[PDB]
Design an enzyme around this catalytic site. Structure first.
Site: not given
Ligand SMILES: [Cl-]
Length: 202
Positions: A53-54, A84, A111, A139-140, A175, A177
């Site tokens: 998160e920022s 990400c 973002r 994801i996001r 991602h 990972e």
């Protein structure tokens, strides 16, 4: 006598949130080091930046005084892999609310929260110099809005850049990972090995 030839790769984040990153690095035969304090950067050959998160990034960078040490790490030629939201830390420009970014890669990023209501998804990707059939888990995912001439595009999705490289910097919006496919991590580790080789000779 002989020393270990294992690469030491840091992961910038909190212990429990970066287990999958540690696992991906270690799966390729490199030693993962969870990095909190700036002094821990000195012994590394490369660094993975998972982001988050920022606000958490803002606090972490400020609390541990990581900005100059991170810029120092880059100046030593050590490869850095932003994944990400970690990709944002490497960017030159941001579209949306300002946040920590080191200006290392010639890219403009945004973002996910800023663009639209994009639901998480998985797509098979063809990654230049890495391989085909790589499952990208989005994801996001931040959006790479623009990339300069010096940036090597490795993969696109719907014609949007999702993986890119510029010298020692590697970035992806997905991602890596979250798959047992180690080809992208291996590509990064190869960059780290080459960089270490080079530093040793001059
Ligand atoms: Cl995307």
């Amino acid at each position: 006598l002989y020393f270990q030839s294992n690469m030491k790769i840091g992961v910038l984040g909190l212990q429990g949130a970066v287990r999958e990153h540690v696992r991906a690095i270690e799966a390729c035969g490199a030693e993962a080091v969870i990095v909190k304090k700036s002094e821990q950067l000195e012994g590394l050959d490369g660094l993975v930046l998972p982001g988050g998160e920022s606000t958490t990034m803002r606090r972490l960078i400020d609390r541990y005084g990581l900005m100059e040490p991170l810029k120092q790490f880059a100046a030593a030629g050590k490869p850095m892999f932003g994944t990400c939201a970690g990709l944002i830390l490497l960017a030159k420009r941001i579209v949306g609310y300002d946040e920590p970014h080191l200006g290392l890669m010639d890219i403009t990023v945004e973002r996910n929260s800023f663009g639209r209501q994009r639901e998480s998804f998985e797509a098979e990707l063809s990654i230049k110099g890495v391989g085909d059939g790589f499952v990208g888990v989005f994801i996001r995912a931040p959006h790479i809005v623009e990339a300069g001439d010096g940036v090597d595009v490795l993969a696109t999705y719907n014609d949007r850049i999702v993986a890119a490289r510029q010298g020692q910097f590697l970035g992806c919006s997905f991602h890596p990972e979250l798959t047992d496919d180690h080809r992208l991590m291996q590509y990064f580790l190869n960059m780290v090995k080459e960089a270490k080789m080079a530093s040793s000779l001059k």
